[PDB]
């Protein structure tokens, strides 16, 4: 119930899952074929050289599918996401007996690369990477639960290197290693997209992203206890890897192809020792190809929800916001307003820059411009921006720019009568 498998069923019946029955190499070929499907359809690789386990990529690659994953029309997606962040819903603990992720359990002679078709994605990558695992951990002093997604380099049979940015997991790990103790974690792979989307919520220090996922789903998310660590994982996941981040240890992780289409450099980083693996009988392995639409939209939609709220606080006339793919759904923002007073553009711009330190470039347009169409936003810039009046620059870590491409308060688009009414097919 609201598992990856049901999501794959939903995609199949919509003709947005295609299978690939011919054998593929997990080294580069999965990523290469996945890139050609980016944004059009999900691919299920039924034969991966060296493995009985299939690989799925591109579960959702456009805003219509993420809206479907949340049971909303596109129009309501951002508000539904912000409502889930504001009002989390408890998860239900469930028995391990009959939980699909407990069907097979491995505690000895663990070899991750032997069990799982973990791909190698881009040319410069140090080796195979796990890119779609939600990482569940608890604060070792306050006990609160956090979920985030981290790249994990497969460095041995039972060892992973992990990039941890200075956010919540880092805070937890900091506390474990001041006490000289490991931090217990669980990794879950093959979950519903709503759960992945929930793992990208940026919140204050103590809100459990699994509870956010619970609010987005039709029923509460069902959890089960791990075998070897005191952590909870989604009962319906495909695969769970249990382990611990080792105190003090630093090993070289990287380099790795990342979201902005550049390499993340190699450096000494924490290490996870894996103490168990559990999975469904005949699991599906999910990978996210870095810088794909799936990768960009996961974080993007979450950042857009926050951006809409921040901008709406200061500019109640805001109709919509979009973090463009060109900007890695992060650096570039387009904001539509139903403008009433001159001065609204500047306020929307100032608000976008407080949404996150990442936003670098902001364009503001009138409500009738479709901000999801780059050609129409460019047209609005071309015809409605006078740069001496309409451009502000922030100099001083990143420079930033704001562009007011709204019509001044005191421009009708040309059209052809009959164009909705008449179809070229009926005349040929």
Ligand X SMILES: Cc1cc2c3c(c1C)C(C)(C)CC=[N+]3c1c([nH]c(=O)[nH]c1=O)N2C[C@H](O)[C@H](O)[C@H](O)COP(=O)(O)O
Task: Choose the one of a copy of itself, K ion, ligand X, none that binds residue 108, judging by a C-beta under 5 to 8 angstroms depending on kind.
Answer: none
> Could you give the CA distance from residue 379 to residue 381 in angstroms, rounded to a whole number?
5
Measure the CA angle with vertex 288, ends 282 and 294; round to 5°.
120
Task: Choose the one of K ion, ligand X, a copy of itself, none that binds residue 388, judging by a C-beta under 5 to 8 angstroms depending on kind.
Answer: a copy of itself
Q: Is 135 or 229 the residue whose CB approaches Mn ion more closely? A: 135
Shortest approach of ligand X to residue 360 CB, angstroms? 16
Chosen residue from 108, 109, 123, 166 binding a copy of itself by CB under 8 A: 123
Chosen residue from 16, 122, 145, 150 binding ligand X by CB under 6 A: 150
Q: Is 121 or 168 the residue whose CB approaches Mn ion more closely? A: 168
Residue 136 zone, left/alpha/beta (φ > 0; ψ -120 to 50; rest): beta
Q: Any bridge partners for residue 83, and if so which? A: none
Residue 151 marked ligand-binding:
yes
Q: Is 202 or 228 the residue whose CB approaches ligand X more closely? A: 202
Question: Between 169 and 188, how does the x/- string for binding to ligand X read (CB under 6 A)?
Answer: x-------------------
Q: Which residues bind Ca ion (CB under 5 A)?
A: 384, 390, 404
Strand ranges inside 265-360, DSSP E: 267-269, 271-279, 285-287, 318-323, 332-337
Check residue 165 for interaction with a copy of itself (CB under 8 A).
no
Q: Is 200 or 310 the residue whose CB approaches ligand X more closely? A: 200
Neighbours of 138 (CB within 10 A): 19
> Please, which residues have CB within 8 angstroms of residue 37's CB and are 6 or more apart in sequence?
18, 43, 57, 58
Please report, as residue ranges, which positions from 133 to 162 form the binding site for Mn ion (by CB under 5 A): 146
Please report, as residue ranges, which positions from 74 to 133 form the binding site for ligand X (by CB under 6 A): 131
> Please, which residues have CB within 8 angstroms of residue 414's CB and are 6 or more apart in sequence?
none
Shortest approach of ligand X to residue 30 CB, angstroms? 14
> Could you give the CA distance from residue 184 to residue 138 in angstroms, rounded to a whole number?
8
Check residue 199 for interaction with Mn ion (CB under 5 A).
no
Structure tokens at 216: 């987005």
> Could you give the CA distance from residue 148 to residue 201 in angstroms, rounded to a whole number?
9
Check residue 168 for interaction with Mn ion (CB under 5 A).
yes
Residue 205 marked ligand-binding:
no
End-to-end CA distance of the chain: 49
Chosen residue from 398, 407, 408, 409 binding a copy of itself by CB under 8 A: 398
Check residue 144 for interaction with ligand X (CB under 6 A).
no
Strand ranges inside 8-120, DSSP E: 17-20, 42-45, 55-57, 92-93, 104-106
Identify the CA nearest to 385 among candidates 367, 398, 366, 368.
366
Residue 125 marked ligand-binding:
no
Residue 330 zone, left/alpha/beta (φ > 0; ψ -120 to 50; rest): alpha
Structure tokens at 276: 């168990």
Q: In 3-state terms, what secondary structure has residue 296?
A: helix
Identify the CA nearest to 272 among candidates 390, 374, 186.
186
Q: Is 411 or 427 the residue whose CB approaches Ca ion more closely? A: 411
Q: Is 304 or 404 the residue whose CB approaches Ca ion more closely? A: 404
Q: Is 69 or 288 the residue whose CB approaches a copy of itself more closely? A: 288
Q: Is 121 or 192 the residue whose CB approaches a copy of itself more closely? A: 121
Shortest approach of Mn ion to residue 146 CB, angstroms? 4
Shortest approach of ligand X to residue 138 CB, angstroms? 12
Chosen residue from 143, 166, 218, 417 binding a copy of itself by CB under 8 A: 417
Residue keyed to tokens 């470039």: 361
Please report, as residue ranges, which positions from 3 to 42 form the binding site for a copy of itself (by CB under 8 A): 18-22, 24, 28-29, 31-33, 35-37
Residue 97's Cβ-count burial label (10 Å; 0-12, 13-18, 19+) is exposed
Check residue 204 for interaction with a copy of itself (CB under 8 A).
no
Q: Which residues bind K ion (CB under 5 A)?
A: 148, 209
Check residue 145 for interaction with ligand X (CB under 6 A).
no
Q: List, as own/partner pairs, every contact residues 392-397 make where C-beta atoms lie below 8 angstroms and the sequence separation is at least 24, other chains included.
A: 392/346, 392/349, 394/353
Check residue 326 for interaction with a copy of itself (CB under 8 A).
yes
Annotated binding site for prenylated FMN: 146, 149-151, 163, 165, 167-168
Q: Which segments are annotated as binding site for Mn(2+)?
A: 146, 168, 209
Query: Footprint of ligand X on this chain (CB under 6 A)?
Result: 131, 146, 148-151, 163-165, 167-169, 200, 202, 288, 290, 295, 298-299
Which residues line the annotated binding site? Answer: 146, 149-151, 163, 165, 167-168, 209, 384, 390, 404, 406
């Amino acid at each position: 119930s609201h598992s990856l498998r049901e999501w794959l069923a939903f995609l199949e019946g919509k003709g947005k899952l295609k299978r690939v029955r011919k054998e593929v190499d997990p080294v580069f070929e999965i990523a290469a074929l996945g890139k050609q499907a980016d944004g059009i359809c999900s691919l299920l690789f039924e034969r991966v050289k060296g493995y009985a386990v299939p690989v799925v990529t591109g579960l959702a690659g456009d805003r219509e599918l993420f809206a479907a994953a949340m049971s909303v029309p596109v129009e309501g997606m951002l508000e539904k996401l912000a409502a889930a962040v504001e009002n989390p819903v408890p998860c239900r603990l469930v028995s391990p007996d009959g939980a699909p992720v407990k069907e097979c359990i491995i505690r000895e002679n663990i070899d991750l690369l032997k069990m799982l078709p973990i791909p190698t994605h881009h040319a410069g990558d140090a080796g195979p990477y796990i890119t779609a695992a939600i990482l569940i951990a608890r604060d070792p002093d306050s006990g609160v639960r956090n979920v985030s997604i981290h790249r994990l380099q497969v460095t041995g049979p039972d060892r992973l290197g992990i990039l941890i940015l200075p956010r919540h997991l880092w805070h937890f790990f900091g506390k474990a290693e001041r006490a000289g103790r490991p931090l217990e974690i669980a990794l879950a792979i093959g979950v519903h997209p709503a759960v992945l989307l929930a793992s990208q919520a940026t919140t204050r220090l103590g809100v459990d992203e699994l509870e956010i996922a619970s609010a987005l789903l039709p029923q509460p998310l069902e959890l089960v206890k791990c075998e070897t660590v005191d952590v909870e994982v989604p009962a319906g996941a495909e695969i769970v890897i249990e382990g611990k981040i080792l105190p003090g240890v630093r090993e070289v992780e990287g380099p790795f192809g990342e979201y902005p289409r550049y390499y993340g450099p190699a450096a000494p980083r924490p290490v996870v020792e894996v103490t168990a693996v559990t999975h469904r009988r005949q699991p599906v392995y999910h990978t996210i190809i870095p810088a794909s639409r799936e990768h960009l939209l996961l974080g993007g939609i979450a950042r857009e929800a926050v951006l809409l709220q921040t901008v709406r606080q200061n500019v109640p006339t805001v109709k919509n916001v979009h973090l463009t793919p060109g900007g890695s759904c992060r650096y570039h923002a387009v904001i539509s307003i139903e403008k009433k007073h001159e001065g609204e553009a500047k306020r929307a711009i100032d608000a976008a820059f407080n949404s996150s330190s990442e936003v670098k470039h902001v364009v503001v347009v009138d409500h009738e411009i479709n901000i999801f169409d780059p050609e129409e936003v460019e047209w609005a810039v071309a015809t409605r921006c006078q740069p001496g009046r309409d451009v502000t620059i922030f100099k001083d870590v990143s420079d930033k720019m704001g562009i007011d491409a709204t019509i001044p308060l005191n421009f009708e688009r040309i059209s052809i009568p009959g164009l909705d009414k008449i179809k070229l097919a009926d005349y040929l």
